[PDB]
DNA sequence: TGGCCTGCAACGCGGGCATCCCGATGCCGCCGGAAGCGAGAAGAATCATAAGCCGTAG
């Protein structure tokens, strides 16, 4: 549900590509932080296979 | 293929023995230098105290 309980939001997306490993992100929490380099799609598919 | 180790035989010189002359040396007495590291001082490696940007939030 949305902020006022009037709409619906999908929890996760039915994706086919691991965008976390392909592009990544760089965010910082209140006490934590993360940083992930991008990668190549073909080698990720090869590793998954 | 060329050179080296060794046996056989001939030659020579020095090991051993003693001693006379000799050179170091242990000891004694007097003098020199270096060590003694402890301490003062200087240089350097390391630790402690500000920003700049990475991207959403106010």
UniProtKB/Swiss-Prot annotation:
Localization (cell): Cytoplasm
Cystines in this chain: none
Note: When the enzyme transiently cleaves DNA a phosphotyrosine bond is formed between GyrA and DNA. In the presence of quinolones this intermediate can be trapped and is used as an indicator of drug toxicity. The enzyme-DNA intermediate is also the target of a number of topoisomerase poisons, including toxin CcdB. Few gyrases are as efficient as E.coli at forming negative supercoils. Not all organisms have 2 type II topoisomerases; in organisms with a single type II topoisomerase this enzyme also has to decatenate newly replicated chromosomes.
Function of the molecule: A type II topoisomerase that negatively supercoils closed circular double-stranded (ds) DNA in an ATP-dependent manner to maintain chromosomes in an underwound state. This makes better substrates for topoisomerase IV (ParC and ParE) which is the main enzyme that unlinks newly replicated chromosomes in E.coli. Gyrase catalyzes the interconversion of other topological isomers of dsDNA rings, including catenanes. Relaxes negatively supercoiled DNA in an ATP-independent manner.
Protein family: Belongs to the type II topoisomerase GyrA/ParC subunit family.
Domains as described in the record: An N-terminal fragment (residues 1-523) can be reconstituted with GyrB, but the complex no longer has negative supercoiling or ATP-independent DNA relaxation activities, although it is capable of DNA cleavage; ATP-dependent relaxation is inhibited by novobiocin and non-hydrolyzable ATP analogs. The fragment has ATP-dependent DNA relaxation and 30-fold improved decatenation activities, unlike holoenzyme it preferentially binds supercoiled DNA.
Oligomer and partners: Heterotetramer, composed of two GyrA and two GyrB chains. In the heterotetramer, GyrA contains the active site tyrosine that forms a transient covalent intermediate with the DNA, while GyrB binds cofactors and catalyzes ATP hydrolysis. Can form a 2:2 complex with toxin CcdB in which GyrA is inactive; rejuvenation of GyrA(2)CcdB(2) is effected by CcdA.
Annotated protein name in UniProt: DNA gyrase subunit A
Location of this fragment in the whole protein: 147 to 195 of 875
